[PDB]
Amino acid sequence: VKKFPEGFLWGVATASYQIEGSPLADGAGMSIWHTFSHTPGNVKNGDTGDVACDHYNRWKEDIEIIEKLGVKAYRFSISWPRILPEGTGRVNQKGLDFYNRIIDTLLEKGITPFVTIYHWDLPFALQLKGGWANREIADWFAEYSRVLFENFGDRVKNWITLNEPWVVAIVGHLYGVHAPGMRDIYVAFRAVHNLLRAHARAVKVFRETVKDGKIGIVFNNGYFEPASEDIRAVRFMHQFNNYPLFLNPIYRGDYPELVLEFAREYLPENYKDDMSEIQEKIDFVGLNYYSGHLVKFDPAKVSFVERDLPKTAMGWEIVPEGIYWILKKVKEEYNPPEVYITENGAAFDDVVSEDGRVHDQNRIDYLKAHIGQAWKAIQEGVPLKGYFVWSLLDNFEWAEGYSKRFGIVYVDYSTQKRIVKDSGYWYSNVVKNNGLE
Ligand SMILES: OC[C@H]1N/C(=N\O)[C@H](O)[C@@H](O)[C@H]1O
């Protein structure tokens, strides 16, 4: 038996562009994911977020599913261009209405909203002005965040500025695999820095606008192990790809040492001028975790080494101890007052059996193991307050399109039927029992 603390927050997570569809409904402006996915060659099968899970229409049903499952918290994101169609200036009341209904419904049903302010769907109008490359985005983002706080901060008390700013900057602007689809290292590092500045401005506005309530930021993380006794290659991957890239500025006022070794010439010349503002106090750290990687020096001077370990449909190695490690490691390095696991989950080739059920034992096994390791971290003093499964629903998985199913609820895209998977049922029992048995 592994029981979690009193009032531990069991959650599920989604993101606006991945689930909503109707990207241009009710006066919404285009996002960069709209234009990126409508550009041939960018997303597998030419898939787009035009329909997705049709949550824009089916939101009440989906929340009733969260309620029926007894899940205590819902992490979801707000589409910036639904709220401010040109990114700044005009506010769209119908966009606010959409999230207002979701928020009120969750509260009526006793479910705690955790709002991700930015989960990657930047207004296209701001991308035309350079998007995350433009220092002025700290202002645009602060203006956007202020609107959300003013409209929803009376009810929503748990906020996340950014989802995975490493991905936004590096996968979006260096690898070019995500919107806005650029390959320029100097742009990517100016995006890193502006994401920090925008995050801090938003926190500053939050303090001025929402007297009660807490704000944090979410990072992607991998568990990197060295191929041999290489150890430095692991050091660099941790500092670059994990929370330190952002938390070293937030807590210590500079980028991590090995990030500066690699990337100093790509940062703005006077980037330290911004660091004291970047240290704006945050209330919690959200860590996302999915996978581990064997890593070797390789003349970024790092390559991955494939291991014969179980993998998900993403090809990601399943390494549950990784979630324990990253929780320990965050406490050891920065000691944030609260931590949440804001995403953990797996993609498998889900099939609806003849019995009408989805027998995803592989996903149950994956979740159980990671929930077990999170439990461990708590016993050793990590202030983990909640854990969010990615995802409530199968959805549009960015450049993979619909080909990767992460839900604990199966979505038949031909009918939009939701079928709760065995993992959703299993999870509901975990939540009801406040832990594993
Ligand atoms: O890959 C599954 C999810 N994992 C994520 N980061 O690792 C993203 O936040 C989320 O939007 C999904 O892409």
UniProtKB/Swiss-Prot annotation:
GO terms for MF: beta-glucosidase activity
BP-aspect Gene Ontology terms: cellulose catabolic process
Pathway: Glycan metabolism; cellulose degradation
Matching InterPro entries: Glyco_hydro_1, Glyco_hydro_1_AS, Glyco_hydro_1_beta-glucosidase, Glyco_hydro_1_N_CS, Glycoside_hydrolase_SF
Catalytic activity: Hydrolysis of terminal, non-reducing beta-D-glucosyl residues with release of beta-D-glucose
EC code(s) of this entry: 3.2.1.21
Active site as annotated: E164 (proton donor), E343 (nucleophile)
Domain of life from the UniProt record: Bacteria
Keywords for the protein's UniProt record, in alphabetical order: Carbohydrate metabolism, Cellulose degradation, Glycosidase, Hydrolase, Polysaccharide degradation
Pfam families assigned: Glyco_hydro_1
Class of the enzyme per the UniProt entry, highest EC level: hydrolase
Family to which this protein belongs: Belongs to the glycosyl hydrolase 1 family.
Protein name: Beta-glucosidase A
